[PDB]
From a paper:
The human KCTD family contains 25 soluble proteins that share a conserved potassium (K+) Channel Tetramerization Domain (a subtype of ‘BTB domain’) at their N-termini and have variable C-termini. The BTB fold of the Kv and KCTD families has a roughly pyramidal wedge shape and consists of five α-helices and a single β-sheet made from three β-strands. Here, we present novel X-ray crystal structures of the BTB domains of a further five members of the KCTD family and examine the stoichiometry and stability of their multimeric assemblies in solution. Overall, the pyramidal wedge shape of the KCTD family BTB domain creates a versatile scaffold compatible with a range of oligomeric assemblies and geometries that may impact function.
Author numbering:
A (entry chain C): 32 to 128
B (entry chain D): 32 to 130
C (entry chain B), D (entry chain A): 30 to 130
Write the structure that this text describes.
């Protein structure tokens, strides 16, 4: 089954399978182990920038993702990784630095 | 004739001729060789990022496509190419990564 | 009456929000504020007679307030035309500046 | 007026307006003036048996009256061929001029 998320105005479409693949905030969001905030149209709202959210979804899907080149973009990706509790990507970004 | 796909929230409108032109998983989706899940508006849902999907559609249509400059986007494309079993583009992306 | 927006830009399909399109003062904000005439189809897509090649970049500039410009002079010029058309004042300058390199 | 026209050019899908296609004297104007046969499908797409690589560039030249030209001579020749075919005389001249070494 598919889940649709509004992350800072950026719209995403993914599955329960992807968001529950790793131990993260998103799994906790969908396991019912945490409240999720939805609107009238059924979008899970997240008050974060959606710039790198697409990168997070890819990491969950493939278990790996190409990291950004510039150090600043690595920190941006890292910040989101820490927030969503994607420990694998957090470490991998810390390693890249 | 025309197919409309929701790829990771990115919406696309293409043709059957394009999606079935080469031997890939996308051909298999519409060759009836596979399950297709659509939403209320009739958009075929695909749980992949749609960033490079436009590039995938063009490769199937034209048999060739301009690759991105940075190594990062080529690798991103390679991941999508590998997933959809676009073997032709996979090779050129693997090849493009020379340095 | 929705905050979710779907736009047909020259045949290129985009799905975005009011939150992104109203971040800066541009033609797109006036278009969705009802402050301007809009042409929609049966399925609820606002039609826009411009190429959608660089439109994704326009949306990202509105979202993040900045975007990586293309390398070649040709594509910066392409973006400049789109930025100017949508009256994206921030992006117009940065691209006009980029051509003075 | 501002009615929408959609063309399938070699598999590339485009959305433009009557206003754009009738701005200049070209083959595309003749297509909508009924001065020439157009083949449409069940969904209302005007079919054109041409590669759609540069058609977006043709549409932009009609929209803005100008467009950034490609760098390489080969791509200028490609665009020039399409301009000649669609009878976009304005763009033909600028492409012929660009190939002046
Ligand atoms: Hg992505
Ligand atoms: Hg951001
Ligand atoms: Hg071509
Ligand atoms: Hg274009």
């Amino acid at each position: 089954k598919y889940v649709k998320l509004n992350v800072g105005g950026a719209l995403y479409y993914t599955t329960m399978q992807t968001l529950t693949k790793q131990d993260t905030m998103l799994k906790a969001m969908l396991s019912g182990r945490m409240e999720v905030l939805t609107d009238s149209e059924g979008w899970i709202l997240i008050d974060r920038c959606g710039k790198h959210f697409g990168t997070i979804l890819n990491y969950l899907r493939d278990g790996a993702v190409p990291l950004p080149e510039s150090r600043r973009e690595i920190e941006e990706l890292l910040a989101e990784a820490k927030y969503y509790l994607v420990q694998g990507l957090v470490e991998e970004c810390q390693a890249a630095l």
